[PDB]
Nucleic acid binder design. Structure first.
Ligand code: NA
Length: 280
DNA sequence: GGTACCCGTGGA
DNA sequence: TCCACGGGTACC
Protein backbone atom coordinates (compact mmCIF):
# COMPACT_ATOMS: atom_id res chain seq x y z
CA UNK A 1 0.00 0.00 0.00
CA UNK A 2 1.04 3.57 -0.63
CA UNK A 3 3.66 2.48 -3.14
CA UNK A 4 5.87 5.44 -3.86
CA UNK A 5 8.70 4.74 -6.28
CA UNK A 6 10.01 8.26 -5.72
CA UNK A 7 12.07 6.75 -2.86
CA UNK A 8 15.08 5.51 -4.79
CA UNK A 9 18.05 3.44 -3.65
CA UNK A 10 21.09 2.32 -5.61
CA UNK A 11 21.60 -1.34 -4.86
CA UNK A 12 24.43 -2.85 -6.84
CA UNK A 13 25.68 -6.23 -7.82
CA UNK A 14 29.29 -6.95 -8.74
CA UNK A 15 30.29 -5.53 -12.11
CA UNK A 16 30.67 -8.19 -14.80
CA UNK A 17 33.79 -9.48 -16.51
CA UNK A 18 32.66 -12.65 -18.28
CA UNK A 19 29.68 -11.79 -20.53
CA UNK A 20 31.49 -11.08 -23.83
CA UNK A 21 33.51 -14.30 -23.61
CA UNK A 22 31.21 -16.35 -21.38
CA UNK A 23 31.24 -19.48 -23.48
CA UNK A 24 35.04 -19.67 -23.09
CA UNK A 25 35.42 -18.20 -19.60
CA UNK A 26 32.78 -20.24 -17.77
CA UNK A 27 34.32 -23.57 -18.76
CA UNK A 28 37.75 -22.14 -17.96
CA UNK A 29 36.76 -20.98 -14.47
CA UNK A 30 35.11 -24.35 -13.76
CA UNK A 31 37.90 -26.54 -15.13
CA UNK A 32 40.61 -24.53 -13.44
CA UNK A 33 38.81 -24.81 -10.10
CA UNK A 34 37.96 -28.51 -10.52
CA UNK A 35 41.59 -29.31 -11.47
CA UNK A 36 43.48 -27.39 -8.80
CA UNK A 37 41.08 -27.80 -5.84
CA UNK A 38 41.00 -28.80 -3.13
CA UNK A 39 44.20 -26.92 -2.34
CA UNK A 40 45.83 -24.37 -0.04
CA UNK A 41 44.90 -20.71 -0.54
CA UNK A 42 48.42 -19.61 -1.52
CA UNK A 43 48.61 -22.32 -4.16
CA UNK A 44 45.10 -21.45 -5.36
CA UNK A 45 45.95 -17.85 -6.18
CA UNK A 46 49.04 -18.71 -8.18
CA UNK A 47 47.64 -21.71 -10.00
CA UNK A 48 44.32 -20.05 -10.82
CA UNK A 49 45.98 -16.94 -12.25
CA UNK A 50 48.54 -18.95 -14.24
CA UNK A 51 45.74 -20.86 -15.97
CA UNK A 52 43.34 -17.90 -16.49
CA UNK A 53 45.97 -15.72 -18.14
CA UNK A 54 46.07 -18.23 -21.05
CA UNK A 55 42.43 -17.36 -21.75
CA UNK A 56 42.51 -13.60 -21.15
CA UNK A 57 45.89 -12.97 -22.86
CA UNK A 58 49.52 -12.39 -21.86
CA UNK A 59 49.06 -8.62 -21.49
CA UNK A 60 46.50 -9.04 -18.63
CA UNK A 61 47.65 -7.49 -15.35
CA UNK A 62 47.80 -9.46 -12.11
CA UNK A 63 45.18 -7.09 -10.71
CA UNK A 64 42.73 -8.12 -13.42
CA UNK A 65 43.45 -11.80 -12.90
CA UNK A 66 42.95 -11.39 -9.15
CA UNK A 67 39.70 -9.51 -9.70
CA UNK A 68 38.36 -12.26 -11.99
CA UNK A 69 39.22 -14.80 -9.29
CA UNK A 70 37.71 -12.99 -6.35
CA UNK A 71 34.85 -11.01 -7.86
CA UNK A 72 33.52 -13.34 -10.54
CA UNK A 73 34.62 -16.91 -9.96
CA UNK A 74 34.40 -16.43 -6.16
CA UNK A 75 31.65 -13.95 -5.30
CA UNK A 76 29.30 -13.35 -8.23
CA UNK A 77 29.24 -16.86 -9.73
CA UNK A 78 29.86 -18.73 -6.43
CA UNK A 79 32.25 -21.25 -7.95
CA UNK A 80 34.47 -22.04 -4.95
CA UNK A 81 34.54 -21.70 -1.17
CA UNK A 82 36.98 -22.05 1.70
CA UNK A 83 36.89 -24.40 4.67
CA UNK A 84 39.63 -24.92 7.24
CA UNK A 85 42.15 -23.11 5.04
CA UNK A 86 41.51 -25.20 1.92
CA UNK A 87 39.73 -24.02 -1.26
CA UNK A 88 37.07 -26.35 -2.70
CA UNK A 89 34.91 -26.36 -5.82
CA UNK A 90 31.34 -25.32 -4.96
CA UNK A 91 28.17 -27.33 -5.50
CA UNK A 92 27.29 -25.03 -8.41
CA UNK A 93 30.63 -25.71 -10.07
CA UNK A 94 30.34 -29.45 -9.39
CA UNK A 95 26.92 -29.57 -11.09
CA UNK A 96 28.08 -27.64 -14.17
CA UNK A 97 31.13 -29.92 -14.46
CA UNK A 98 28.65 -32.86 -14.68
CA UNK A 99 25.92 -31.34 -16.88
CA UNK A 100 27.49 -28.53 -18.98
CA UNK A 101 24.16 -26.69 -18.61
CA UNK A 102 24.90 -22.99 -18.77
CA UNK A 103 21.29 -21.82 -18.53
CA UNK A 104 20.86 -24.00 -15.40
CA UNK A 105 23.98 -22.48 -13.87
CA UNK A 106 22.42 -19.04 -14.23
CA UNK A 107 18.93 -20.23 -13.21
CA UNK A 108 20.50 -21.31 -9.93
CA UNK A 109 22.26 -17.98 -9.49
CA UNK A 110 18.93 -16.21 -10.05
CA UNK A 111 17.16 -18.57 -7.63
CA UNK A 112 19.67 -17.91 -4.84
CA UNK A 113 20.39 -14.21 -5.32
CA UNK A 114 19.06 -11.78 -2.76
CA UNK A 115 19.66 -8.46 -1.09
CA UNK A 116 21.33 -8.08 1.30
CA UNK A 117 24.11 -10.50 0.59
CA UNK A 118 27.74 -11.35 1.30
CA UNK A 119 29.07 -10.40 -2.14
CA UNK A 120 29.19 -6.73 -1.21
CA UNK A 121 31.93 -4.91 0.68
CA UNK A 122 31.10 -4.59 4.41
CA UNK A 123 30.29 -0.86 4.26
CA UNK A 124 27.80 -1.56 1.47
CA UNK A 125 26.30 -4.50 3.47
CA UNK A 126 25.82 -2.20 6.46
CA UNK A 127 24.13 0.38 4.19
CA UNK A 128 21.69 -2.18 2.80
CA UNK A 129 20.94 -3.64 6.22
CA UNK A 130 20.52 -0.07 7.57
CA UNK A 131 17.95 0.57 4.83
CA UNK A 132 16.03 -2.61 5.77
CA UNK A 133 16.43 -4.09 2.33
CA UNK A 134 15.16 -7.71 2.03
CA UNK A 135 14.19 -9.20 -1.28
CA UNK A 136 14.67 -12.12 -3.64
CA UNK A 137 14.88 -9.92 -6.68
CA UNK A 138 14.68 -12.51 -9.46
CA UNK A 139 11.50 -14.18 -8.24
CA UNK A 140 10.15 -10.68 -7.82
CA UNK A 141 11.11 -9.51 -11.38
CA UNK A 142 9.60 -12.63 -12.86
CA UNK A 143 6.33 -12.05 -10.97
CA UNK A 144 6.24 -8.39 -12.07
CA UNK A 145 6.67 -9.56 -15.70
CA UNK A 146 3.92 -12.21 -15.32
CA UNK A 147 1.63 -9.61 -13.79
CA UNK A 148 2.41 -7.17 -16.64
CA UNK A 149 1.41 -9.81 -19.21
CA UNK A 150 -1.74 -10.62 -17.20
CA UNK A 151 -2.66 -6.95 -17.42
CA UNK A 152 -1.80 -6.65 -21.12
CA UNK A 153 1.20 -4.33 -20.86
CA UNK A 154 4.88 -4.79 -21.53
CA UNK A 155 7.78 -3.29 -19.60
CA UNK A 156 11.02 -1.68 -20.65
CA UNK A 157 14.37 -2.03 -18.96
CA UNK A 158 13.91 1.52 -17.65
CA UNK A 159 10.57 0.54 -16.09
CA UNK A 160 12.22 -2.37 -14.29
CA UNK A 161 15.07 -0.09 -13.24
CA UNK A 162 13.01 2.75 -11.75
CA UNK A 163 9.98 0.94 -10.43
CA UNK A 164 11.65 -2.29 -9.20
CA UNK A 165 15.45 -2.60 -9.00
CA UNK A 166 16.14 0.97 -7.81
CA UNK A 167 12.91 1.41 -5.77
CA UNK A 168 13.65 1.51 -2.05
CA UNK A 169 10.16 0.31 -1.09
CA UNK A 170 10.26 -2.62 -3.46
CA UNK A 171 13.76 -3.57 -2.28
CA UNK A 172 12.48 -3.40 1.34
CA UNK A 173 9.88 -6.01 0.47
CA UNK A 174 6.92 -3.67 1.11
CA UNK A 175 5.28 -3.74 -2.32
CA UNK A 176 3.22 -6.30 -4.29
CA UNK A 177 3.94 -6.72 -8.02
CA UNK A 178 0.38 -5.70 -8.86
CA UNK A 179 1.00 -2.36 -7.09
CA UNK A 180 3.99 -1.78 -9.36
CA UNK A 181 1.97 -2.61 -12.45
CA UNK A 182 -0.96 -0.41 -11.43
CA UNK A 183 1.43 2.51 -10.80
CA UNK A 184 3.12 2.07 -14.20
CA UNK A 185 -0.28 2.05 -15.89
CA UNK A 186 -1.32 5.26 -14.06
CA UNK A 187 1.96 6.97 -14.86
CA UNK A 188 1.70 6.08 -18.56
CA UNK A 189 -1.87 7.41 -18.60
CA UNK A 190 -0.44 10.73 -17.44
CA UNK A 191 2.35 10.60 -20.05
CA UNK A 192 4.94 10.06 -17.32
CA UNK A 193 8.01 8.02 -18.20
CA UNK A 194 10.87 7.31 -15.80
CA UNK A 195 14.57 6.46 -15.88
CA UNK A 196 17.30 5.99 -13.28
CA UNK A 197 20.09 8.58 -13.40
CA UNK A 198 22.35 10.18 -10.77
CA UNK A 199 23.64 13.76 -10.63
CA UNK A 200 26.93 14.15 -12.44
CA UNK A 201 27.28 10.38 -12.99
CA UNK A 202 27.65 8.37 -16.16
CA UNK A 203 24.97 5.90 -17.17
CA UNK A 204 27.08 2.88 -16.17
CA UNK A 205 26.92 4.04 -12.53
CA UNK A 206 23.17 4.19 -12.70
CA UNK A 207 22.33 1.23 -14.88
CA UNK A 208 25.09 -1.30 -15.41
CA UNK A 209 24.15 -3.40 -12.34
CA UNK A 210 20.51 -3.26 -13.35
CA UNK A 211 21.16 -4.32 -16.92
CA UNK A 212 23.48 -7.06 -15.71
CA UNK A 213 20.93 -8.51 -13.31
CA UNK A 214 18.59 -8.75 -16.27
CA UNK A 215 21.44 -10.35 -18.30
CA UNK A 216 21.65 -13.20 -15.82
CA UNK A 217 17.93 -13.82 -16.14
CA UNK A 218 18.43 -13.83 -19.92
CA UNK A 219 21.34 -16.29 -19.64
CA UNK A 220 18.99 -18.50 -17.58
CA UNK A 221 16.71 -18.46 -20.68
CA UNK A 222 13.84 -16.98 -18.66
CA UNK A 223 13.62 -13.65 -20.49
CA UNK A 224 14.65 -11.92 -23.68
CA UNK A 225 15.87 -8.34 -23.56
CA UNK A 226 15.42 -6.40 -26.78
CA UNK A 227 16.02 -2.71 -27.55
CA UNK A 228 12.55 -1.73 -26.35
CA UNK A 229 11.24 -4.36 -23.91
CA UNK A 230 11.96 -7.09 -21.42
CA UNK A 231 9.80 -10.14 -22.22
CA UNK A 232 9.33 -13.58 -20.69
CA UNK A 233 10.34 -16.65 -22.63
CA UNK A 234 7.25 -18.84 -22.21
CA UNK A 235 9.10 -21.82 -23.67
CA UNK A 236 10.50 -21.87 -20.10
CA UNK A 237 7.09 -21.36 -18.46
CA UNK A 238 7.73 -24.21 -16.00
CA UNK A 239 10.90 -22.62 -14.63
CA UNK A 240 9.47 -19.10 -14.76
CA UNK A 241 6.54 -20.14 -12.61
CA UNK A 242 8.59 -22.11 -10.09
CA UNK A 243 10.96 -19.26 -9.44
CA UNK A 244 8.33 -16.49 -9.61
CA UNK A 245 6.38 -18.19 -6.80
CA UNK A 246 9.10 -17.19 -4.32
CA UNK A 247 8.47 -13.47 -4.92
CA UNK A 248 6.81 -12.94 -1.54
CA UNK A 249 9.36 -14.88 0.51
CA UNK A 250 11.83 -13.34 2.88
CA UNK A 251 15.41 -13.93 1.79
CA UNK A 252 16.52 -17.47 2.58
CA UNK A 253 19.75 -16.13 4.05
CA UNK A 254 19.08 -13.85 7.01
CA UNK A 255 21.57 -10.95 7.12
CA UNK A 256 19.79 -9.44 10.10
CA UNK A 257 21.00 -12.03 12.65
CA UNK A 258 24.58 -10.77 12.39
CA UNK A 259 26.10 -7.99 14.48
CA UNK A 260 28.29 -6.06 12.03
CA UNK A 261 30.19 -4.37 14.84
CA UNK A 262 31.25 -7.83 16.06
CA UNK A 263 34.54 -9.04 14.65
CA UNK A 264 33.43 -12.69 14.86
CA UNK A 265 30.07 -12.01 13.15
CA UNK A 266 31.72 -10.03 10.35
CA UNK A 267 33.68 -13.16 9.53
CA UNK A 268 30.79 -15.61 9.93
CA UNK A 269 28.56 -13.48 7.71
CA UNK A 270 30.74 -13.85 4.65
CA UNK A 271 31.49 -17.52 5.27
CA UNK A 272 27.85 -18.44 5.85
CA UNK A 273 26.79 -16.41 2.80
CA UNK A 274 29.22 -18.31 0.58
CA UNK A 275 27.94 -21.67 1.88
CA UNK A 276 24.32 -20.67 1.21
CA UNK A 277 24.98 -19.19 -2.24
CA UNK A 278 27.53 -21.58 -3.71
CA UNK A 279 26.56 -25.01 -2.31
CA UNK A 280 23.62 -27.38 -1.97
C1' DG B 1 50.68 -1.84 3.73
C1' DG B 2 47.42 -5.72 1.35
C1' DT B 3 43.46 -7.29 -0.48
C1' DA B 4 39.42 -7.11 -2.85
C1' DC B 5 34.88 -5.36 -4.09
C1' DC B 6 33.84 -0.53 -6.33
C1' DC B 7 33.38 2.02 -10.28
C1' DG B 8 35.60 5.81 -13.86
C1' DT B 9 36.60 5.33 -18.09
C1' DG B 10 37.00 4.30 -23.12
C1' DG B 11 37.75 0.46 -26.71
C1' DA B 12 34.82 -2.60 -29.05
C1' DT C 1 25.57 1.46 -25.80
C1' DC C 2 27.77 -2.46 -23.66
C1' DC C 3 30.71 -4.03 -20.53
C1' DA C 4 35.30 -4.93 -18.41
C1' DC C 5 40.31 -3.23 -17.29
C1' DG C 6 42.65 -1.98 -13.63
C1' DG C 7 43.13 2.05 -10.59
C1' DG C 8 40.04 3.68 -6.51
C1' DT C 9 38.65 2.97 -2.30
C1' DA C 10 37.87 1.28 2.30
C1' DC C 11 37.77 -2.80 4.81
C1' DC C 12 41.22 -6.41 6.17
NA1 NA D 1 7.01 -8.59 2.36
Amino acid sequence: MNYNPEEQFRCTIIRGKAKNMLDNLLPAYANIIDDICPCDKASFVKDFNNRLIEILGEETTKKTLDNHRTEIAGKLFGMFYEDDEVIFPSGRTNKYIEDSDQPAFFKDICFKFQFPNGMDKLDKVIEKVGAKIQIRQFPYILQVLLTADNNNIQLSKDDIAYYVLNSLQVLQGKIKPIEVIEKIIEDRSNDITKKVRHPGKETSYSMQHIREQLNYLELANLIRIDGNLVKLNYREAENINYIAQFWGNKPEFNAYKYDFTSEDDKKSFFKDWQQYYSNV
